[PDB]
Each structure stands twice: as structure tokens, then as C-alpha cells.
Amino acid sequence: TTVTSYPGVYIEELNSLALSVSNSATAVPVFAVDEQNQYISEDNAIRINS
């Protein structure tokens, strides 16, 4: 863990495993567009917000 070589003040911050569970993005869909639609670029997930 810590090595003590020279006389002095050693600060070492031991911290326990902080574990918490985040809940986010329950229903985020994807839309398989029509193959004929020329505006969607080929093989790229173009993302829209509103």
C-alpha cells in the first residue's frame, strides 16, 4: 500500500467501493426507416431530438 522512505507527512486517501445504481433512459426507441428514403445516410444512426 504505502511506502515510507523519507521523514515527513504522508497523505494517502483510502476509499471504500462506492456503488450506486442509476436509472435512466427507460424507453428510447430506434426507427427502422424505409429503404427508399434517400435522406437517411447509409449505415449511420442519425439521431434526432425533437
Place this chain on the structure above:
Amino acid sequence: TTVTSYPGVYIEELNSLALSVSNSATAVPVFAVDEQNQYISEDNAIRINSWMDYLNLIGNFNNEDKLDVSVRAYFANGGGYCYLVKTTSLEKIIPTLDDVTLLVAAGEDIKTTVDVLCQPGKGLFAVFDGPETELTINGAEEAKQAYTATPFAAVYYPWLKADWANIDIPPSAVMAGVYASVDLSRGVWKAPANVALKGGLEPKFLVTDELQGEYNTGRAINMIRNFSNTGTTVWGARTLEDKDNWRYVPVRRLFNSVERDIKRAMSFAMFEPNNQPTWERVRAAISNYLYSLWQQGGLAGSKEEDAYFVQIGKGITMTQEQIDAGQMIVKVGLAAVRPAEFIILQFTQDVEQR
């Protein structure tokens, strides 16, 4: 003991065997420099402390040469002091050195020198660098063939590419700094994987998850993988050996730093006469070291009778005829913790069944 010749006051200070175990220098690496680098002197372990201390050797030229980039990337990740030796005289300098415990190849192909160097008794777990070329998934049987399976090694696949110093950084010198950073921060028993690289360097080759499936078995190659949560992280704690005992670089490097902290303490009790007063001090001093690791969580088990055991005594470990040859025998057991390589989650809909 004392002789009484004249009438007077005699002061004699009898003192018992004071034995304590010191833990220091867990991960201090050496760098096999390139043979062409003219600045390293021939057959001398020139020792550097920091990058401003290293810059007095050479004031410029951070950009191109592969040793010069590697030690710059080493100090950026983790802090330590490292010796620099030429690979020609690598086997001559390392046995006569104080604390060299990571023989780190800074891209120099020194596999033969490593095998000659480290017996099972010495220690010095020695990391390697992966092949700088592309590794496909169906060419897995040949890419493992170059490395020979030994439990004192570790391979890291993708050579790293940084913004500064546009030549390719070898992954072995980068991972050498993460070892000294993890062993200082969270101790030696915690696995050196799952730690983001503090230097601003990205992997040159992207890692598919199915590509890591058939490489992280057998004599495994650990793989540095970058994903979005933590950036470019190291993602392998396996060594080059596939058996149940010595599968992990935390379970290997804990048995190096315990078998070197006790060996320095045994020099104080070296020529002490072995009877019941002597090997009660040696038993009680070793068992306090193995108790201090258990309170830190380095050893598994519920209570201290299961985490470790130490046995010295006439009878129990050595017979009478071995005492007459003057060799006392210490048996030491350790249950080192192994990392959670595959955390699995089982979900049932039967909650009253339990």
C-alpha cells in the same frame, strides 16, 4: 555471558530478538533500453527519479526514439523510479540490484533474457508487450505461439498511439506505470486492470469484444480496451499461465511482495540459534504481517484461522536431524484474493422460493 572479575557495578543489556517485517518498493521497474541508444552507458544501471531528473541525461528529443517516448509515458501514468539498462548486459546487472521487481521490456524482444533471469525463487514478475501488428480472430493459434507460457509474465495487445511523440508507444512501459500507481493507491492485491490511463494516449487498434473472447484464454493476452464511461482502460489481469493456482497478476504479485518482505526480515534472524525462544519470535513476527494483510482485505476467508497459517517447531515442520544440519523450515499459507473477472447475474421471478 557475563564475567565478574572486580567488585563493582556491571551493566549488561540483554535484549530479545526484535523482529518486524517491512513492506516497501512493491513495483519498481527496470527498462531494457534500446541497444542503439548511445546515451545509456554500457553495463551500468543508470537510475532516474522523475522526468526532470531524466531530462538532465538528454535535454531534447522527446519526439522520436521509442525508449524516449516510453519513459515519458511511464512517468505520466504512475510515479516511480526506474533503472535503465541495455538489453545486451541485461542478465548481468539485474541480479546485483536492490529492488527490481518489474523487468519491463520497452519494445525490445527480450523474452529469452526474461526466462534465464527469473527462477521461481527470485521473483520479479516481468511484463511484456503485445505484437504491434493486427491480430485477427481466426489467427489466434499463431499469435499466441511466439510467447512461451510462464507464470511470471503478462502481455498487453494494442500498441498505444499518443498526440505528442507521434511514434507508437509500446504498451508494456505504459502498463508499468499503472502497476506502481495501483500498488501505491489500493495495494498490491488489487488487480491492475480497470484503471483509466492518465496520459492522453489512445489505443492504435480498436478492440472487438468477440476478439477478446478467444484471446483471453490459454496463455492469455490482456487487451487494452477503450469504452465511453472511463476512457481507455486496461482490461486484463491474467498472466501468461492457464492453471488454477497462478492465473492472475494480482495473485502472482502478492506472492512476490510477501516473499520479499519476509526475506528481508529473515536476514535479521539469520544466524540466531534455533530453539523454542527463537522460532516463537519468528512465528509471531511473520503472523503479524499476515494478519495486517487480512485486516486490509488482501486475504480471503472469514476468520484468521482460515486466511493464513504459519508453522515452525521441532516436530511439526522439521525433524530433529534437520536441526542438526542447521536448517529451520517455515511453512506459510496464503489465500490471496482473485479479481472478479466474470461477474454474472442470475435473475429469478421466484421470490418466496429463495
